[PDB]
Amino acid sequence: KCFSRTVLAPGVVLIVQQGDLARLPVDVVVNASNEDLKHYGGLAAALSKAAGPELQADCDQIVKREGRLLPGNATISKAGKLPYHHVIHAVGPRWSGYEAPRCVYLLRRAVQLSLCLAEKYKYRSIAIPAISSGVFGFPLGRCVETIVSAIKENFQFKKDGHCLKEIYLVDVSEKTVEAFAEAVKTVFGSLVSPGGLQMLLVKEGVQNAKTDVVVNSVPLDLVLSRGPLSKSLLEKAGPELQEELDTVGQGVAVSMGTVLKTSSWNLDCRYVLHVVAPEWRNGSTSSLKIMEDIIRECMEITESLSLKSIAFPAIGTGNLGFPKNIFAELIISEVFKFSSKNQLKTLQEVHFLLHPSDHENIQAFSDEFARRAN
Ligand SMILES: Nc1ncnc2c1ncn2[C@@H]1O[C@H](COP(=O)(O)OP(=O)(O)O)[C@@H](O)[C@H]1O
Ligand SMILES: Nc1ncnc2c1ncn2[C@@H]1O[C@H](COP(=O)(O)OP(=O)(O)O)[C@@H](O)[C@H]1O
């Protein structure tokens, strides 16, 4: 029973509909899951029953191979006896009123990651439930608004190269469907955190940063001449930047998440923190958590050094393949989370340094600054 159909873009329709996820005319469905991909409750239990034991069995193997998932994650499995070849498992957050904006961030991310997986498998149609609104306690209104916003951003941020043509928003309950239909109706340069830490969008080369600390993205072997970000810093710094990094790196088993500190030489800052950022890897649990850990660590270092400001470029969004909107939203959320749960003595400003030519990054950050400021 269809409640509304809304044309998003040429060839793309959003359909709000009462129905059962186990039985819909789509290529793939998104299951509302948990960290262990264990389908003991809610919609997941109904899906699992209709699928038979293959679904849980393949999920157990995925968790065994890649480890447990975290909130705001998604993965894909086999579908057993469902009328689909795969099921996408979204892990929404467990709701807390004390952490509402972070929960919003994590639900949105699980949806964005699920869409990405669908587009990677070239699917044309997907059904999506009110993830987190059952056992995980997310207030129904905010939940559906968040899911619908994620979908709008999916087609609005990058308009090119989408395979998806039908998106179904579904639940067995008439009340949840009406919430979805209402959400659809409604949806279609400086920030400051509660603790006082301020975020600035700065449109220039990171080699022109005038913060205490500047963040660089480097590969495993610490060579600074290979990515356009490090190369820009190396050219403005002088070759002693390379020699000092190699020196401070001696004896380090460098890996994803390694952060090494050097002086600035010809740069206008006091220190450079060189980070080894993860590959996107289809938005894996590790890729997202490690990037967040890196961002938190650079801030903690700046605080521990009694300094006031740090400049981040859009690390991970070139060679390493992080979608730029997803990254911007990740670093912004992380800065709010850290700022909110910590009493900072000296750290007061975070600058996002975006290259003048990088219009996609500028739009990513501007869009999120706008959502946050409203
Ligand atoms: N057995 C079921 N059959 C159909 N829908 C269900 C069933 N159990 C829960 N739901 C609905 O699925 C949606 C998601 O809830 P749930 O499965 O608990 O996911 P979550 O843990 O992420 O909140 C909610 O609308 C919930 O009412
Ligand atoms: N001089 C610069 N200042 C700020 N940002 C830059 C500069 N040069 C490139 N960028 C942006 O830095 C981001 C990261 O690029 P890259 O050097 O490939 O690092 P990564 O391996 O972490 O993806 C890209 O979005 C690129 O557009």
Side-chain angles (χ1 to χ4, degrees), residues 84-99:
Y84 323 111
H85 302 301
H86 290 102
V87 167
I88 289 170
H89 301 273
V91 177
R94 296 146 193 284
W95 173 255
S96 160
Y98 301 95
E99 289 180 333

Side-chain angles (χ1 to χ4, degrees), residues 86-329:
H86 290 102
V87 167
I88 289 170
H89 301 273
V91 177
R94 296 146 193 284
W95 173 255
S96 160
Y98 301 95
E99 289 180 333
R102 181 68 182 175
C103 290
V104 169
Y105 167 78
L106 295 168
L107 174 55
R108 215 265 232 76
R109 195 170 80 183
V111 174
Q112 292 169 319
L113 293 172
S114 302
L115 295 171
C116 289
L117 285 170
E119 311 225 67
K120 169 102 171 306
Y121 282 75
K122 310 303 213 314
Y123 289 133
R124 282 181 72 268
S125 61
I126 189 162
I128 304 173
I131 299 150
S132 278
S133 76
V135 176
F136 287 177
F138 207 122
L140 180 58
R142 294 284 310 174
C143 169
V144 297
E145 293 183 84
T146 298
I147 297 164
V148 176
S149 304
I151 293 161
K152 174 175 142 67
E153 179 183 336
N154 186 64
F155 296 99
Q156 155 201 251
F157 178 66
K158 175 160 184 78
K159 297 162 175 54
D160 345 274
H162 298 282
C163 280
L164 282 169
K165 294 183 58 50
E166 305 168 14
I167 301 154
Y168 285 82
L169 296 175
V170 173
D171 195 77
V172 297
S173 169
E174 200 177 50
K175 308 285 206 181
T176 295
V177 173
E178 289 178 62
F180 265 131
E182 156 174 64
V184 164
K185 279 183 43 168
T186 67
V187 172
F188 291 98
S190 189
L191 278 177
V192 56
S193 80
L197 183 167
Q198 93 172 263
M199 290 163 260
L200 288 190
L201 199 167
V202 182
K203 184 185 146 262
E204 71 197 356
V206 67
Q207 75 275 11
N208 278 75
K210 298 196 154 39
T211 49
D212 295 338
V213 177
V214 300
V215 181
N216 190 19
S217 189
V218 306
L220 284 174
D221 64 0
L222 309 182
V223 167
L224 298 177
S225 58
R226 199 141 66 216
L229 187 60
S230 311
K231 205 151 58 182
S232 306
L233 285 168
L234 180 73
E235 184 171 1
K236 178 86 202 281
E240 301 88 0
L241 196 60
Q242 183 64 87
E243 162 71 348
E244 192 184 341
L245 180 55
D246 294 327
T247 301
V248 80
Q250 290 175 233
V252 171
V254 180
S255 73
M256 293 320 111
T258 295
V259 172
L260 290 161
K261 177 168 69 63
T262 70
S263 69
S264 62
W265 299 91
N266 268 43
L267 289 165
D268 290 319
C269 59
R270 286 170 197 167
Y271 299 100
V272 178
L273 301 184
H274 308 263
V275 313
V276 182
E279 299 184 325
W280 174 239
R281 293 182 38 77
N282 269 186
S284 74
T285 297
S286 286
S287 300
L288 296 169
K289 171 181 129 57
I290 291 163
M291 184 63 91
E292 290 167 346
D293 286 346
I294 288 181
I295 290 155
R296 181 182 35 80
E297 193 179 350
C298 291
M299 291 190 294
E300 287 169 344
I301 293 173
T302 306
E303 173 75 354
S304 89
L305 286 164
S306 297
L307 298 167
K308 292 186 186 167
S309 61
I310 181 160
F312 289 95
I315 56 182
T317 67
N319 290 333
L320 290 167
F322 272 64
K324 293 176 174 178
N325 57 328
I326 290 181
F327 181 74
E329 291 154 16

